[PDB]
Amino acid sequence: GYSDRVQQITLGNSTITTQEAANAVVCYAEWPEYLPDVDASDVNKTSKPDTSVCRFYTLDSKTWTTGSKGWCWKLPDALKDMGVFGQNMFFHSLGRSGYTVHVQCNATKFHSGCLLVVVIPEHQLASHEGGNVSVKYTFTHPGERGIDLSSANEVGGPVKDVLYNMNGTLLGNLLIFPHQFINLRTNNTATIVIPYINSVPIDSMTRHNNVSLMVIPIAPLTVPTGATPSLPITVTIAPMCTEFSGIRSKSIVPQ
Amino acid sequence: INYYKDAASTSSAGQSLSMDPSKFTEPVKDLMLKGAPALN
Amino acid sequence: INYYKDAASTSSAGQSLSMDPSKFTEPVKDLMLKGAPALN
Amino acid sequence: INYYKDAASTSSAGQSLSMDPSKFTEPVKDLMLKGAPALN
Amino acid sequence: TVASISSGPKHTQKVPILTANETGATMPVLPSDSIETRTTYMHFNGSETDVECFLGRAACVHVTEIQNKDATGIDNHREAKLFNDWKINLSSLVQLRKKLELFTYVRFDSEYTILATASQPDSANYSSNLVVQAMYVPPGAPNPKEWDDYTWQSASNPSVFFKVGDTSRFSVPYVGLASAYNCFYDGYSHDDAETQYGITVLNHMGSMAFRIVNEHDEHKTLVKIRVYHRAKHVEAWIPRAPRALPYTSIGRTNYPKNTEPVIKKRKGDIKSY
Amino acid sequence: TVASISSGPKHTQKVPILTANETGATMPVLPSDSIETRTTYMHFNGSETDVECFLGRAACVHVTEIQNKDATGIDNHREAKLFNDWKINLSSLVQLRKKLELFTYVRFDSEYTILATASQPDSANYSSNLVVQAMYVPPGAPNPKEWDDYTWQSASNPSVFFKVGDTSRFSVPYVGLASAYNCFYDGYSHDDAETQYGITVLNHMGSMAFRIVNEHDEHKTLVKIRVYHRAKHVEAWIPRAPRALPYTSIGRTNYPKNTEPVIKKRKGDIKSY
Amino acid sequence: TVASISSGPKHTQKVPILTANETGATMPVLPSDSIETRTTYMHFNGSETDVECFLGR
Amino acid sequence: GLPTTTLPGSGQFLTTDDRQSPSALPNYEPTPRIHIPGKVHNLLEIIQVDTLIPMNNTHTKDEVNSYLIPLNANRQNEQVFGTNLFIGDGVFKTTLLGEIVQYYTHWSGSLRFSLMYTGPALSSAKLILAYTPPGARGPQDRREAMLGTHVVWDIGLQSTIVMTIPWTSGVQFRYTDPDTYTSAGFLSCWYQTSLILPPETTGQVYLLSFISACPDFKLRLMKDTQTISQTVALTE
Amino acid sequence: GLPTTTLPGSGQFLTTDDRQSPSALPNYEPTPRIHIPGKVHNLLEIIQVDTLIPMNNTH
Amino acid sequence: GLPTTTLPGSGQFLTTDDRQSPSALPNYEPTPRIHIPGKVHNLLEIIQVDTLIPMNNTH
Ligand SMILES: OCCOCOCc1cc(CCCCCOc2c(Cl)cc(C3=NCCO3)cc2Cl)on1
Ligand SMILES: OCCOCOCc1cc(CCCCCOc2c(Cl)cc(C3=NCCO3)cc2Cl)on1
C-alpha cells in the first residue's frame, strides 16, 4: 500500500509528511555524503553539529497569484539566519552541506496551475544593465526573502526576466537541471535532495552560493469560480551532512 | 609512442565509451519501472 | 604502419584480385554450355 | 634513444627525488628529539 | 547492437506510454512501445559526440597585433603596439565559448597554435623576416614595459620564438587552482559590498605577451597574431541550458537590453505546418 | 597462368562458335575454339585496371581565385573575391567526371590536395607571403559574409591554414548520406511539379570557403586555388555506357543542341580498309 | 603520502612546540603538534622545484 | 643522418588533427581531481533528457506563454496544433535537442514527443496525436491524420503521454538544417472526443509539450551552429 | 632530436603517389554499406561484355 | 628515403623544451667530481630552514 504518493522525511527533530508527492529527485543521482580524506585539503578537523543543523527550516511563505513571475532563493544564503545553522556559517572560515528541499502548494480538484521547481548549480546571474555591469553582493544575497522575479529592476541588482533564467538561457531548457513540477491536478509538493557540488572540497559559505532553488509558475494559476484568486507556496529546506571548518572570529558581511 | 615526457603533451584522449544518461534522465529516489503506473 | 587513427586516412586499397565477369557476361537464368546448342 | 655519442648531448636529467633537508635544518652535533626539552 | 527489436500487436494492462512528467524523469520510451517494429541494428557508436571530440579541435581564441617600427621617441611602447598583451581567458571569442558553457566545470590540458602573418600596408621595398617572441607572464612576474626590457630575458618564464608566417605550437597542462575550471561562479572574491561578481575574479590566469625580436627596417610592418586553442584530455561536469541571447562581456552572463525575440514566430497559426 | 592452351584440328558435332546473342550472354569463346593454338602464359595480373587504381590518382576538380587587397569601402567581400567559395561537387570538371560516370553508385574516401600560387599582375615591390585558410562549411553552418567574420573562428568546423606556393593535404571519410554516392538519380526531392530533376538535389554537400589571412600590403595579390581529389578505398556498382556527347551542366545528363556526329564517318565504303 | 595525520586533544609533559633556536636547528614542527588535524594526502612530489628543473630552461 | 622526403601538406595547420606537442611547463603538477556529481561523457547522454518546446510560437516577443498549448472545452473533431518535423528549425530550434542537433550535420533516430496535461483534476479529455511520414501533406482533418502513426491519449491520473516518432526513412540519415529530400513528416493533434470542464470552472486549460531523443539516435559530422555569432571580440 | 637529411623531391606533389593523410573529420562514422547487385572490380571484367560496332560508318 | 610530413611548430625555439644536441667538444673529458659538503637537490629542501622576518618594518 506504499504509494509513490505518500512520504515521510524525518531529519533531526523535525518531520514532514506529504500525502500527494510525485516521487523525489536526487540530483545527478547522488545523495549528500561527508567529505572524504582522499579529497581533503585543509588540515583542520571539521565540526559536524549533526542534528542541531540538519533539521528542516521553513522559510516565510510566498503568494502565487495570476500575475506571479517566479521566485529565486540561493543556498546557503536562504538559511544564513536559521538557528545554529546560521551561527556556524558566520563563525567558520569554510563549511560544506547538501540539502533536502521540500516545496509545498495545495489547492483543490477544481484549480489548475503548474510550477517548475528546479535546482541550478552555480547560477551566475546577469546584470539588467548589459555590458559588464556587475550584480552587487546584497542583490545576490536576498536571505530568506529570496528574489521576486516580478519585482522591479533595481540598480546593482540582477535582471528578473523569466524567459531567460536570469542569465541568457531559455526557460524551456531548465529541465536539463534536477527539477520536479507541482501540477495542482497531480502533485502538491516537490522534493529534491541536493548533494554538495563544487570544484573545491569545501568553500566559503558567505562569498559563494552553490545552488539557486527556483520556483516558477509555468501554467498560470486558475482558480474555480469566485474562488480567491491566489494560493500560498511554502519552501522548507534542511541542511544535510553539514560540516564546518576553520573556526574563529565571525564574519562581517556587507549590508 | 610518446616522444615527450609530460602527460599534457600527449594527443587527444580516446572515447569514453562510458555513456550513462540515467543520472540526467532518471534521478528519481524510488525507481520507476516502464509499464508500471507512474503514481501508485 | 598507420600513423593516424581514422581509417579514411590510410593509403589506397590493394587489388581486389576479385574479378568475375559472369554477372555481366552471362546473366542468363538457365546455364549455357559452350559447345552445346544455344537454343534447344 | 641517444642519437649522439657524448654525454653532454643528452637531455635534461630526471628528478633527484633525493631530498634531505637535515643537512640544512638540523646540523646539530647532539641529536635533538622533538618533544624532549631543547636544553637539558 | 539492436536499434529496434521486432515487436507485434499489444492489448495489455501494462502501458509504458502513460507517465507522470511531474516526477522529473524522462522515461525511456521506444518506438516499439507504441507501434509494431522489425529488427534493425545501430551500425553506430556515438564516437563523434564524445566530449573529448566535441571540445578537441582548435578554435580561434584571440587575434591581436603588434608592429615593428622605430621606437625612437615612443613614450609608451605598449601603446604603440611595439609589443602587446593578452589578459588570458577563453570566453573572449564566442564560437568556442558557447560550446564550453554547455557544462559548469571543465578540466583539460590546452594545446595552443599561434599563427602570425605580416602586412605592409604602405610602400615597402620588401617583406622583412621577423621573429616573434611570446612569453607567458604569470600573475606575479614583471610585466614588460618596453619592447626590449630585462623581462624579455625570460630566464624562468617559458617563451617560444618563431617566424612570422610560421606557426608555433606547444601545450600547457591544466593550470587551474581548483579541481576544474569554473565555467560559472555565483560568488565574489570576498564579502565586500562593491567587489566584482562572476568568474573574472576566479579566472585570474595572468597574461601573455608578444613582441618582434627584430630591430626596425626602413618601412613599418604590421604583424597580426592569432591564438588557437584545442582542449585535450577533457572532463566536463553538470550540463546546463545552452546560451540563447548574445554575449556582452568576458565573464559575465549579461545579455544586451532590447535584444530580439530568440524564438522564431510562426508565419500562421499554432495549427500551421 | 595459361593465356592459351595448345589445341589441334577439330571435326566435331560440338560447335562452340555458333551462339544466339539474343539471349543477352557474351559466350566465353577463345582463340583455341576456332584455330590451332600453342601454349602461352599470361605473365600479367590486371593490376592497373583495378577500380581502386583507375579512380585512385589525384585529378584537378576545381580552380577558384581570391585576392588580398584593401577591403576598405568594399560592400561585398564575396563579390570582390576577398574570399570565396565553392559549392562542393565533383562533376564540375569533366576528365574525372567521365571516369566516375562509368559506374552508377560509387563509394570512397577522398584525399584532397590544394595548391595555391600567387600572381602580381601589376607593379609590386615584392611578393608577399600570404597564408590561405579554407574552411569546410556544412549544409547548415553560417556562411561567412566578410573576409573576417566570426565564421572564420571555425571553432567546430575543420579548417586548414597553409602558405600560398605550398600545398595542403588532408583526407575526408565518405560523407554520403546513403550507402553510396549516386552518379545518377532518376528522381526528384519530392513530388512537386516544378522541382529540379537529377542529382543536384541529392548531391547536396555544402560548400568550401577560402580566404587569405593576411591584411593588405600596398599592392594587390591574386591567389588562384586548385583543388585536386583522389579517391581511396573505392567501391563501384553497375557499369554503364561511357559518355559520348559533351557535358553542359553539373548534375544533369543534358548534352548540347546541334552537337556533332560522334561516330567518325568512313573516308570510303563500308568495304574500305 | 600523508600531508597531515589525524591528531586529537593533547595534555602532555611532552611539548614539541617549545624549542631553543640558539642551537641553529629548525625543528620539524607540524600543524598536528599544536591543533587537532584530520588526515589529508599530499598528491604532489615536488618535481618542479628540483634544481635540474630550476636551472634547466 | 637518416634520409627523408617531405610530402604535400608539410607545415599545414589543420584545426582537427591530433598530435603530440612539447609541454611549456615541464614538470608541473596539476591539482588533484576531487569527485563532482554530474559528469557528462557524450552529448548523446544529454539529448535524452526532455525539455519543453515553445510550440505556441504565435507571440510577438518571447514569452512564457509560447510554451503553453491551449485547449478549448466542448470543441469536437477539431485540431489542437500542427508543426513539421525540422528538428533544426522552427519550434524545435531552441530546445536542448534542437540546440545540439545544430552542432552536427546529419541525424538519424527516433524522437520522443510527450504532452503533460495541466487542467483541473475533475475535467477529462481524449486527444489523438498523429505522426505523418514524409510523402503526404500535413493532415487537414483527423480522418486524414488518423491514417498514419497515432496514439489516442486518455487524460487521467497519469498526467503525461509519450508519443514516439519512429524513424521512418528511405535514406539512413537526414540533414539537421531543413532539406526537402531529407524531410521527416508532420506532427498534428486533434480532439478525439473533447475537453470537458467540471462545474464552477472555466476557460482554457493548457498542455505542456516536451522533446527528447530515443536511445536510437545518431548525430554525425560536427559543424558550427547558426545559433550564435558576434561582431567584435568581447572584453572584460 | 633525431638527425635527418631531405632528398631531392621533397615537397613535390605527384598526382599518382599513395600515402597517409590526417582525416579532417576525426571520429565520424560513415553510413553502413547495404548490398547492391552489380559490383565492378576490374575494367577487365566489363570489356568482356560485347557491344555493337557502328560498322556502317558511311552516314 | 622515408616519407615525412612536418607539423605546426616546426622550427620554433621553446626555452622550456628538453632535447638532445650535438656536443661542440667531441670527446672531451670533464674534471673528476670531488666530494663537497652541502649539495642541494630541491628548493623544497632549503625553504624549511628558518630565517628572520623584518617584522618591524616601520623604519
Ligand atoms: O569562460 C570559458 C570557459 O571557462 C573555463 O576556463 C577558461 C580558461 C582557460 C584558460 C587558459 C589558462 C592559461 C593557459 C596556460 O597558459 C599558458 C599560455 Cl596561454 C601560454 C604559454 C606559453 N609558453 C611559451 C609560450 O606561450 C604557457 C602557458 Cl602556461 O584560462 N581560463
Ligand atoms: O557526379 C560525379 C560523381 O558522383 C558522386 O558523388 C560526387 C561527390 C563528391 C563529393 C565530395 C563530398 C564532400 C567532400 C568532403 O568534404 C570536405 C571537404 Cl571538400 C573539405 C574539408 C576540409 N577540412 C579542412 C579543409 O577542408 C572537409 C570536408 Cl568533410 O560530393 N559529391
PDB file of N, CA, C and O in Angstrom, chain E residues 42-48 53 57, chain I residues 24-32:
ATOM      1  N   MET E  42      22.117  -0.887 -35.043  1.00  0.00           N
ATOM      2  CA  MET E  42      22.585   0.527 -34.911  1.00  0.00           C
ATOM      3  C   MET E  42      23.662   0.800 -35.900  1.00  0.00           C
ATOM      4  O   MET E  42      23.648   1.862 -36.541  1.00  0.00           O
ATOM      5  N   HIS E  43      24.621  -0.072 -36.081  1.00  0.00           N
ATOM      6  CA  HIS E  43      25.707   0.325 -37.024  1.00  0.00           C
ATOM      7  C   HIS E  43      26.334   1.619 -36.565  1.00  0.00           C
ATOM      8  O   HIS E  43      26.841   2.268 -37.526  1.00  0.00           O
ATOM      9  N   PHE E  44      26.414   1.997 -35.337  1.00  0.00           N
ATOM     10  CA  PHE E  44      26.991   3.351 -34.990  1.00  0.00           C
ATOM     11  C   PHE E  44      27.437   3.387 -33.575  1.00  0.00           C
ATOM     12  O   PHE E  44      26.678   2.738 -32.784  1.00  0.00           O
ATOM     13  N   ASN E  45      28.413   4.078 -33.083  1.00  0.00           N
ATOM     14  CA  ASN E  45      28.852   4.076 -31.739  1.00  0.00           C
ATOM     15  C   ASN E  45      28.697   5.358 -31.036  1.00  0.00           C
ATOM     16  O   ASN E  45      28.867   5.309 -29.809  1.00  0.00           O
ATOM     17  N   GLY E  46      28.561   6.453 -31.696  1.00  0.00           N
ATOM     18  CA  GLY E  46      28.432   7.738 -30.945  1.00  0.00           C
ATOM     19  C   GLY E  46      29.812   8.245 -30.598  1.00  0.00           C
ATOM     20  O   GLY E  46      29.905   8.996 -29.593  1.00  0.00           O
ATOM     21  N   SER E  47      30.814   7.929 -31.357  1.00  0.00           N
ATOM     22  CA  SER E  47      32.157   8.339 -31.276  1.00  0.00           C
ATOM     23  C   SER E  47      32.427   9.863 -31.283  1.00  0.00           C
ATOM     24  O   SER E  47      33.374  10.284 -30.638  1.00  0.00           O
ATOM     25  N   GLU E  48      31.697  10.517 -32.197  1.00  0.00           N
ATOM     26  CA  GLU E  48      31.983  11.953 -32.559  1.00  0.00           C
ATOM     27  C   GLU E  48      31.203  12.951 -31.755  1.00  0.00           C
ATOM     28  O   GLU E  48      31.175  14.156 -32.053  1.00  0.00           O
ATOM     29  N   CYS E  53      35.911  14.792 -28.169  1.00  0.00           N
ATOM     30  CA  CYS E  53      35.871  15.105 -29.598  1.00  0.00           C
ATOM     31  C   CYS E  53      35.248  16.486 -29.782  1.00  0.00           C
ATOM     32  O   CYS E  53      35.666  17.296 -30.600  1.00  0.00           O
ATOM     33  N   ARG E  57      38.938  20.215 -30.948  1.00  0.00           N
ATOM     34  CA  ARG E  57      39.557  20.720 -32.257  1.00  0.00           C
ATOM     35  C   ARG E  57      40.016  22.113 -31.952  1.00  0.00           C
ATOM     36  O   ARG E  57      39.373  22.745 -30.971  1.00  0.00           O
TER      37      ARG E  57
ATOM     38  N   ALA I  24      40.226  15.052 -41.807  1.00  0.00           N
ATOM     39  CA  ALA I  24      39.627  16.321 -41.394  1.00  0.00           C
ATOM     40  C   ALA I  24      38.454  16.099 -40.429  1.00  0.00           C
ATOM     41  O   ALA I  24      38.269  17.020 -39.630  1.00  0.00           O
ATOM     42  N   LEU I  25      37.724  15.077 -40.516  1.00  0.00           N
ATOM     43  CA  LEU I  25      36.616  14.657 -39.733  1.00  0.00           C
ATOM     44  C   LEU I  25      36.991  13.466 -38.801  1.00  0.00           C
ATOM     45  O   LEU I  25      36.655  12.295 -39.055  1.00  0.00           O
ATOM     46  N   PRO I  26      37.707  13.796 -37.756  1.00  0.00           N
ATOM     47  CA  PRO I  26      38.115  12.779 -36.778  1.00  0.00           C
ATOM     48  C   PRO I  26      36.818  12.260 -36.155  1.00  0.00           C
ATOM     49  O   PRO I  26      35.995  13.023 -35.813  1.00  0.00           O
ATOM     50  N   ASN I  27      36.793  10.960 -36.101  1.00  0.00           N
ATOM     51  CA  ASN I  27      35.817  10.145 -35.472  1.00  0.00           C
ATOM     52  C   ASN I  27      34.433   9.933 -36.005  1.00  0.00           C
ATOM     53  O   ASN I  27      33.665   9.386 -35.183  1.00  0.00           O
ATOM     54  N   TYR I  28      34.242  10.377 -37.161  1.00  0.00           N
ATOM     55  CA  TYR I  28      32.991  10.356 -37.929  1.00  0.00           C
ATOM     56  C   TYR I  28      32.685   8.946 -38.348  1.00  0.00           C
ATOM     57  O   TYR I  28      33.656   8.227 -38.746  1.00  0.00           O
ATOM     58  N   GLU I  29      31.500   8.529 -38.333  1.00  0.00           N
ATOM     59  CA  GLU I  29      31.064   7.218 -38.699  1.00  0.00           C
ATOM     60  C   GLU I  29      30.295   7.115 -39.944  1.00  0.00           C
ATOM     61  O   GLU I  29      29.050   7.463 -39.965  1.00  0.00           O
ATOM     62  N   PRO I  30      30.877   6.544 -40.997  1.00  0.00           N
ATOM     63  CA  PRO I  30      30.188   6.507 -42.327  1.00  0.00           C
ATOM     64  C   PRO I  30      28.935   5.686 -42.348  1.00  0.00           C
ATOM     65  O   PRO I  30      28.817   4.786 -41.486  1.00  0.00           O
ATOM     66  N   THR I  31      27.993   5.919 -43.267  1.00  0.00           N
ATOM     67  CA  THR I  31      26.786   5.112 -43.371  1.00  0.00           C
ATOM     68  C   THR I  31      27.139   3.683 -43.668  1.00  0.00           C
ATOM     69  O   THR I  31      28.077   3.459 -44.515  1.00  0.00           O
ATOM     70  N   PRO I  32      26.421   2.763 -43.067  1.00  0.00           N
ATOM     71  CA  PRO I  32      26.659   1.312 -43.254  1.00  0.00           C
ATOM     72  C   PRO I  32      26.580   0.946 -44.705  1.00  0.00           C
ATOM     73  O   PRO I  32      25.775   1.660 -45.419  1.00  0.00           O
TER      74      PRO I  32
END
